[PDB]
Amino acid sequence: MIVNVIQKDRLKEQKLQFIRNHQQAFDVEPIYPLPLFEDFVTSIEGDCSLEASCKIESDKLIASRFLLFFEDKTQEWQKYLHQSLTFFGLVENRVGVKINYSLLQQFLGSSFDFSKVTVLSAGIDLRNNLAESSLKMHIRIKDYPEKLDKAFALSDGAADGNYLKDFVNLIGFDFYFNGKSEIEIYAEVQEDDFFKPEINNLVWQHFPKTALQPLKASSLFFTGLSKANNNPVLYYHLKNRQDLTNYFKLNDTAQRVHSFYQHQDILPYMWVGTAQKELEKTRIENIRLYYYKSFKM
Ligand SMILES: CC(C)=CCSP(=O)(O)OP(=O)(O)O
Numbered sequence: 001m002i003v004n005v006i007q008k009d010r011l012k013e014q015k016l017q018f019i020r021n022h023q024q025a026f027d028v029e030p031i032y033p034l035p036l037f038e039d040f041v042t043s044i045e046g047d048c049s050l051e052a053s054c055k056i057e058s059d060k061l062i063a064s065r066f067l068l069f070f071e072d073k074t075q076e077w078q079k080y081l082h083q084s085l086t087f088f089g090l091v092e093n094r095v096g097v098k099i100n101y102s103l104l105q106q107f108l109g110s111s112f113d114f115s116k117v118t119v120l121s122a123g124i125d126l127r128n129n130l131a132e133s134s135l136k137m138h139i140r141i142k143d144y145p146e147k148l149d150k151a152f153a154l155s156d157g158a159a160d161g162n163y164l165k166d167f168v169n170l171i172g173f174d175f176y177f178n179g180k181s182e183i184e185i186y187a188e189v190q191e192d193d194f195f196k197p198e199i200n201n202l203v204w205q206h207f208p209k210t211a212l213q214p215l216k217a218s219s220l221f222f223t224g225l226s227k228a229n230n231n232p233v234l235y236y237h238l239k240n241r242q243d244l245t246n247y248f249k250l251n252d253t254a255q256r257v258h259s260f261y262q263h264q265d266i267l268p269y270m271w272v273g274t275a276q277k278e279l280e281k282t283r284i285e286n287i288r289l290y291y292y293k294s295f296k297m
C-alpha cells in the first residue's frame with residue numbers, strides 16, 4: 001500500500017512536470033484554462049500517456065495543445081468516456097460556454113459497443129481568442145463497420161474521400177468554445193504494408209513522391225479524409241524524434257521546437273503533421289509536431 005501511495009503522488013507530479021516543461025518553453029504565461037486540464041490529467045490514476053504539441057504557421061507558434069490517452073490495461077472505455085465528458089462539462093461551467101456535442105452523440109448513438117474501442121483520448125487546444133479554443137477527443141475502433149459507416153455519413157460524405165474508406169480506424173472530434181464542432185476520419189497504412197503492390201495501387205499512387213520519402217523513418221502513416229479536398233494533412237509516426245530534420249525541411253520556428261525536445265526525457269517516437277503541398281516546397285511553413293511521455297505504475 002505504501003508503495004502505491006508514493007507512486008501515485010510521483011505520477012501526478014511527473015504529468016504536471018511534462019505539461020509545465022512544454023508550456024514554460026513556449027508560452028511565458030499559461031493560456032486559460034490550462035489548470036482545468038491539469039486537474040483532469042491528475043484525476044486519471046490508471047496508466048496513461050500524454051501528448052504535447054506545437055502547431056506552427058510560419059512564425060506563429062501555437063503551443064497550448066495537450067492530450068491524454070487512456071492506457072489502463074482493464075480497458076474500461078465507457079468509464080473513461082464518462083470521465084472525459086465530465087471534464088468537458090467543467091470547462092463549460094468555468095469558461096461560461098456551451099459545447100456542441102451532436103457529432104459525438106450521433107456517432108455513439110445506436111447502442112455503442114465499447115469492446116470495439118482500442119484507443120481513447122481527451123485534450124485541449126487553447127487560444128487567447130476563446131472562440132478559437134477547442135476540446136479534443138479521438139476514438140479508435142476495430143472491426144466495427146456500422147460505426148465506420150456512421151462516421152463517414154457524419155463527415156464530408158461521398159467519393160472521393162470514400163476511396164480510402166477501408167483504411168479508416170481512427171475518428172477525431174473537435175469541440176470549439178463558440179459551439180462549432182467537427183469530425184474527422186483518418187485513413188492509415190502501417191509499416192508492414194508499405195511495400196505491398198495493392199497499397200501502391202490504392203494509396204501511394206495518389207500522392208506526390210515527396211509524400212513517400214518520410215515513410216523510410218516511419219512506422220505508421222495517417223491522412224485526414226474530410227477536410228481539404230486538395231492538400232490533405234499527412235501524418236507520419238517517426239520511430240525516432242531525431243529523424244525529424246532529416247526528412248522534413250523545418251523553418252526557424254519548428255527548429256526551435258525540435259531543438260528543445262532533442263534532449264528532454266520523453267519517448268523516442270513522435271508524430272509529424274503537414275499538408276501535402278508543404279512537402280513539395282523548398283521549406284515547410286506549416287507543420288504540427290507531437291511529443292509523448294508515458295505514466296505507468
Ligand atoms: C491523428 C494524429 C496523428 C494527430 C492528431 S490530428 P488532430 O486533428 O486531432 O489535431 P490538430 O488538427 O493537429 O489540432
Ligand SMILES: [Mg+2]
Nearest residue numbers: 172174184224
Ligand atoms: Mg485536426
